[PDB]
């Protein structure tokens with residue numbers, strides 16, 4: 001009665017004092033921004049609330065080796081470019097596969113890449129790149145690889161990388177908000193020297209393999225699962241699942257089906273997926289195949305899922 005106002009008044013003070021998203025009810029609707037960076041899965045886009053990754057923000061994506069985290073980041077890179085943006089890849093790992101990147105949709109030719117000498121240089125170069133104003137996205141691969149110059153010069157010992165990140169991030173956060181650039185930090189499972197990244201990041205994503213998809217004895221890629229453990233732009237703790245196919249990446253068509261049935265926009269009478277009276281396919285694969293062959297209906301289904309949600 002008289003509490004609902006005192007609560008709303010307190011929530012408003014918190015919002016004004018520390019910014020939007022400082023407090024949220026988990027049932028709240030996502031507040032929709034002008035532009036986001038789609039992730040490649042509509043499922044993940046919905047779990048993120050705002051339909052993609054936020055701009056001008058620190059994003060962390062973490063998981064075990066060979067989990068899908070990079071693939072997810074490369075899809076962000078592909079989508080940012082497809083919207084006419086520029087991308088940079090700060091590489092301290094040296095594992096990137098550009099052919100794979102190509103098949104996801106990355107314009108590798110125009111992808112700025114840097115292979116820095118030290119952890120500080122990696123972040124400095126990231127910073128100069130961001131302050132330009134010309135960059136839509138920058139991926140850092142990865143936190144664990146940002147080894148301190150001192151350590152690489154064989155020279156203080158404990159906490160130097162953690163201090164290197166904290167400092168870098170303090171400066172970088174402003175540059176990002178001002179520039180509108182998204183910075184994805186990839187991280188192996190304070191897991192890496194990213195005790196600080198945990199607090200600077202506006203989105204944190206936990207990526208994992210759930211089960212290997214099969215096509216006989218030799219299968220195909222994996223069913224991936226992402227939890228949005230931190231989300232300052234929409235209520236957190238949302239999970240999403242989607243498929244990553246070896247050589248292809250995230251099955252956009254697969255996420256449309258799943259979320260299609262989830263929303264009742266697609267009906268599954270037996271093994272037959274149907275859409276607005278028409279049949280899509282028998283079994284998931286045929287329905288998936290039907291959607292790549294007919295991009296018109298795929299976009300049709302995508303348009304309908306977005307409307308129903310945001």
Ligand code: NA
Nearest residue numbers: 095096097100
């Ligand atoms: Na790769």
